[model samples]
Target: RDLYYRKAKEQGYRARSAFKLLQLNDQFHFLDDPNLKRVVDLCAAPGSWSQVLSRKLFDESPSSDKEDRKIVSVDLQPMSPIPHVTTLQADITHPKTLARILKLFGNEKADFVCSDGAPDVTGLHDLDEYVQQQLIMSALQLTACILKKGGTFVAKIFRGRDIDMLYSQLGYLFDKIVCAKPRSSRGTSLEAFIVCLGYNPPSNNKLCISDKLSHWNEEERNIAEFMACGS
Candidate 1:
């Protein structure tokens, strides 16, 4: 951790974890594409992810042709303004949040969507993973609704007792899904980043983003939720 802390300081990033996001992009070249016009950063706080996004797309506090690119950062807590990043204070569980993001996008779909947010951890394993799944569901709902065809979605999830459920569900929405663990991330931790690419809509797609989110069942509820909760 100290290595990252020092590296972050020298790199002028907002936080140490910002490099992790950058490292994610190093393997996935989508971050550098000029066509990456619209991006959504869910659970962005302390403003690090947004900073990387700003530099990656706009090359720092863009001056002219700013309308060509848009990066929307969402969170329940207030975030410091970044040059190209539009800060929105909102909750993922709420429909209005999705509406507002779409509104900012001006009816155009997003090219990328990602979430680094984690739910508040309770001591209980089932309950904690359950809450995490809820958060992932909310993020995916927004991604499913907003991403353009062949777009991408990335999320940091706990690879705990019920991780397979998450991996299984995302399989439907994306053409390729990779469970990547960045070198920056610790192996001992149950953290895994789901990199989903090539968004594909269902043949009979129905309901808005919020409506679809409400459909998460018991399996989605805990992800690792088992009939035998003897753990």
Candidate 2:
């Protein structure tokens, strides 16, 4: 029992984690944008993030065409229900999952995407970090498929030794990549949120979901080599 835990019950949130998303949006203001039409909440099992999306997007916020706004929540496990959110029981890593979300939005890409998913931690430090990275990769892959240009993506990440490498790769797709930690999150933990804004997929190249990161690295290396030689 913690402060947020007590506060969550008083506020009728599904979980104490709702405050994390609330605090994060207070800083970024993504939820406040009127043009934010479609949103996705990945790995939304206990549905705290989905609940926040519902309350902000429909219950409280003002939108001209309320019917046109859409929210989709995806998870391998079944979630109970959040108003204004379509719960999709599916794996985030699958292409079919992308298709379903797009269909729900009438073929329009999402305005914002977020994932609070993390793998079950094993005791091994190295293995835990690797598994967490893989989960983030899967979320990003699906995000690339369903998110519109200039969209925003927010996902939970662990600050590990190789995090800078991940940041460099993500820099290609987003105008800003901020590593954020909400006050609701425990200070002792390595957990942080990566809030990526202004999606800008490379125009000249086809983005492959699985191999895109390494491809970007290769492209950067090639540019460095060209600069070094100048010939």
Candidate 3:
């Protein structure tokens, strides 16, 4: 377990992100929960998370019924195919992408939604935190749509100063929220995980969303467009 990087290579995963996700499940066991069927993995390109998602849901064998077990990976970048994962080239902030995620779950709510997304930061700490908060919020807004009433949502946090304010806001949607940090990474990084258990919304979840990636300015966004669209 200590040599997770090399171990990941032995296991044919993309990187240690595969091991990171699995270890979290070792504690919480959400991915392997018998009642857990449908999942939405956000910002999952290069597919370290998607690789794990497939292994947990199936034995790398495709399920006959899509609803029997479903894994949808959404990101601005396209992911290479992994067994049992429907890689969607979609942005999390848009309403249509959220709608499509619903449609993929056979129009049923998802049992879990997880994201391993972070934005490139600027030297200005305050501005960076705001953008990071929006990145989380974009994922949260989409989560509010696809996640079932009593489902789970997991996302990465940069462990910045503004995280307390972010935590307070997430408290509104989740009945229980816990910050999960790994010992090996405790002092080495500013990134951590938030586990939101038991969604208990007040029956007024907002659906209108048209967010752009807050980390990107107009020029960088134009770069994303040209990269994806070849224009």
Candidate 4:
């Protein structure tokens, strides 16, 4: 209790965001194995979540005794360095951001992608929902592109409109999806997280991007004719 009070007084981490990530891992077990070597924390700043990842993946704790780890955190703001974690100042929405991350990892795809990023909150509920949805979508797009097959994606999202759409998108790509509200998150806040595990890039027929879907539809017609002849 004394240590908690002292840390609270320091204000480096006033709330329980750290526990939220811990509870998330408890439920999903995405970080269960020692094979998670590369991780990216999008919109990570002031670095609490990054700290958790660093501790779980790289700290000299008993749990991480078997393997080495590397974590790269990206945010628009600067952060003090943490051991085994590299901080990069970058915006998630930019086209170059993914490439930069890839380059930084020596062209290796991330084993895990985590985004705790959210937009500046506005007082209006509807507008805030829209902003939150946009942020999630932007992060999802990046996750789809660069995360390795079977990698895990985790992002915080406010419960609001477009959640079903987001679920449908995730369902097409990941073998399992889980929605969780961690114990550390405020009860009053409508925030929750969506975890996409065992990501499998959809085949061309199942791809959902507009242009790609159109092309897949054309290919389906040709395949249908072949099936008609029982070939």
Candidate 5:
């Protein structure tokens, strides 16, 4: 139905959505770093993002260094095999899933993490947006646990009235956050990607997957209080 669809079919990528990741990387250049070794694709069923990751991270690397590159794809749904990609059928919101992803990286944190996940919609825009935000939060929690300092995270989002709040929350963790719209994404669609770079967590703020969301909100307030009071 679109140019990207035809291109994806001819190019052998699994989904037309693959071009969104392509254009995002083109602008952000997150995939161009030579030191990029470990990557995770959250909710990556059908594995288009994983495929782009495989091609960029492994296929482009020198044969000798290819062994150093690792790609882990996680989703609740199973995915078919892709070269040099380890597919894990797991929920992104679970603590054990973080442990599994970390183990695959040899106990090291990932250099890049992405989620192109969206929930099944029921034509209710408000409800749809709220669930999408929760999904983003879930992915962010997992990312905070597994991403290395100064790493990058990219996830799909819907631009709504509360998006600025999400941006502010993300600002606390990432040094830079951009609401990116790839050319392949339809103009009429409300969807966009939040490209969060420089994963700089607050000092002394330990992120544990077991912690509740309210715990993080408390931590933010504590940091704010300390910053103002010099405590």
Candidate 6:
């Protein structure tokens, strides 16, 4: 009781932000896979999402008997320490940041990437919406670059003009996509989360198109003229 009361008083957590992440996981079952052991939490200051992920992946229950669970939390601000979670104080937008994460993972891609990053609100809806879009885009790009094939990505976004454009880009990269707003989220808040699954890395030669022409190609074009005349 005292712990709860002190937490409520000093930390300002009604039940800790971990409760919100647990509620979301219960509804979506995104963590159902037994093999999803590696996770990355971006903008993870205050570390609630990191707490939830660590607890879920490292559960002592017989059902969660696995050995390779890992969670890396990254943010620009310093954080209070949590066991089974590694906290990195760094900017998410830096080009070398992802490289550092990959190094921590032994150059392996993560199974899931979660971002709850939001820009400081400006009170103006238009300006706030634009900042939200940029944050989501940056998260998406980072996910695309570091996530393994068939990994999952979840990020917060505000509904606005560029939402469809973001969705279309996700469609090209993921096989399944979902939009979810957890009950713990304030009803009045305009924030929503986009969950993308089954990441498919684009092939290096997928964009390559042949521009070479041969004598046979010229003959085929000439035959097309002859056939038109006959018709």
Candidate RMSDs in order: 6.6, 7.3, 10.0, 9.9, 7.1, 13.8
Candidate 6 on 12-73: residue-level lDDT in tens? 34334454555567655666667777789998878778777766777532455455667899
lDDT of 6: 0.67
Clashing pairs in 5: none
TM-score of every candidate: 0.82, 0.88, 0.80, 0.78, 0.86, 0.76
Task: Return the lDDT, model 6, position 68.
Answer: 62
Summed over model 2, clashes come to 0
Candidate 4, poorest ten consecutive residues by summed lDDT: 222-231
**How well does candidate 4 score on lDDT at residue 219?**
25
lDDT of each: 0.75, 0.80, 0.72, 0.70, 0.80, 0.67
Two-way TM-score contest, 2 vs 3, winner: 2
For 37-121, candidate 2 gives per-residue lDDT tens digits of 8999999988999999999989987657466899999999999988888999998866678788888988988899999988777
Off by over 4 Å in 1: 60-67, 120-124, 202-231
Candidate 4: lDDT over CA atoms?
A: 0.70
Model 4 alpha-carbon drift over 4 Å, by segment: 1-15, 60-68, 202-231
User: In candidate 1, where is summed lDDT lowest over 10 consecutive residues?
Assistant: 222-231
Give the C-alpha lDDT of model 3: 0.72
Report the C-alpha lDDT of model 5 over 154-186, residue by residue, as the tens digit. Answer: 899877656665665666688777777788887
- Candidates by TM-score, descending order: 2, 5, 1, 3, 4, 6
For candidate 2, the 10 contiguous residues with the lowest summed lDDT are: 222-231
Q: Report lDDT (Cα) of residue 111, candidate 4.
A: 88
Residue-wise C-alpha lDDT for candidate 1, range 117-141, written one tens digit per residue: 8766666878878777778877776
Q: Candidates 2 and 6: which is better by lDDT?
A: 2
| Ten contiguous residues minimizing lDDT sum, candidate 5 | 222-231
Candidate 6 lDDT trough over 10 residues, lowest sum: 222-231
**Most accurate candidate by TM-score:** 2
